[PDB]
Amino acid sequence: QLTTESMPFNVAEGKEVLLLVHNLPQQLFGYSWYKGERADGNRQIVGYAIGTQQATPGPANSGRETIYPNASLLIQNVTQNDTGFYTLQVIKSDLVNEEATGQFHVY
Amino acid sequence: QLTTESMPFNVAEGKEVLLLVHNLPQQLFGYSWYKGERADGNRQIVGYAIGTQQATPGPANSGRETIYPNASLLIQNVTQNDTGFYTLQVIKSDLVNEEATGQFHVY
Ligand code: NI
């Protein structure tokens, strides 16, 4: 069952958090992470295509995010404006896609 | 900008609606249609793979839906329950995606 987890859940301003991804299904084109609680293009952070290991930023990219081959997202030098929810969308090769929403709190 | 237009917007019960698609982006991998206002997997009608030309039903498929290679969706035998919003997500090859949401009303 596709989920995320925030490491740590409570993040000091300036510090870092890892959004870790469990249970990626088989046969993927790629990954798409978003800010907020849904897949929304205006709030896309990064697109990652797995056969080419190419990452492409979206409208919400700050420059402080790093996406990994297993879908995990590290954000560095966390700001109060990074607080709350994020969404991962996993794109399957039949286009029947899966989403996972997680969150952390900046203090 | 990606848009959809319902043809016709106003549908008699038991008739047909074509959700047309304007301004597809470049270099894409496939399409995803959903019931409602968001790209939620649990409300996915259909995923269409442009590469292979293959449509896979999602969970919200009723057997009345037909997707065309240009992303337009046909809903046949419409009921009073179908009035509302429908969302396409177009999955691009750099996985940085776009959505557009339209609607129809059944009398
Ligand atoms: Ni009415």
Author numbering:
A (entry chain B), B (entry chain A): 1 to 107
Task: Quote the paper.
Human CEACAM1 (hCEACAM1) is a single pass type I transmembrane protein expressed as 12 alternatively spliced isoforms that all contain an N-terminal V set fold of the immunoglobulin superfamily (IgV) ectodomain followed by up to three type 2 constant immunoglobulin (IgC2) ectodomains (A1, B, A2), a transmembrane sequence, and a signaling cytoplasmic domain. CEACAM1 function is triggered by intercellular or trans binding of the IgV domain, resulting in higher order surface CEACAM1 oligomerization and subsequent intracellular signal transduction. In contrast to other immunoreceptors such as the T cell inhibitory and mucin domain-containing protein 3 (TIM-3), programmed cell death protein 1 (PD-1), and programmed death-ligand 1 (PD-L1), CEACAM1 serves as its own primary ligand, owing to high affinity homophilic interactions of its unique IgV domain, as well as an important microbial receptor. The displaced CC′ loop forms a cleft with the FG loop that exposes the key residues F29, S32, Y34, V39, G41, Q44, Q89, I91, N97, and E99 critical in mediating homophilic CEACAM1 interactions.
The V39A mutant crystal contained two copies of a hCEACAM1 GFCC′ face–mediated homodimer in the asymmetric unit. The first hCEACAM1 V39A dimer comprising molecules (a) and (b) resembled a WT homodimer with RMSD of 0.7 Å (over 1482 atoms), whereas the second GFCC′-mediated dimer comprising molecules (c) and (d) featured important conformational differences across several beta strands and loops with RMSD of 3.0 Å (over 1655 atoms) compared to the WT homodimer. The major distinguishing feature of this second V39A homodimer structure compared to that of the WT was the increased separation between interacting CC′ loops (10.0 Å vs 3.7 Å). Further, we observed a considerable decrease in hydrogen bond and weaker hydrophobic interactions at the GFCC′ face in the V39A homodimer, consistent with a less stable and less interactive GFCC′ face that possibly reflects an hCEACAM1 IgV monomer–dimer exchange transition state. Interestingly for both of the V39A-containing dimers, a considerable metal ion electron density (4.0 σ intensity in the 2Fo–Fc electron density map) was observed at V39A molecule (a) and (c); the density was modeled as nickel (Ni++) that was hexa-coordinated by residues H105 and V106 from three neighboring IgV molecules found in the unit cell and crystallographic symmetry mates. A CSS of 0.0 was calculated for the weak GFCC′-mediated V39A dimer (formed by molecules (c) and (d)) consistent with a monomeric species whereas a CSS score of 1.0 was calculated for molecules (a) and (b) consistent with a dimer and thus suggestive of the possibility of both hCEACAM1 V39A monomers and dimers and furthermore, a rapid monomer–dimer exchange model.
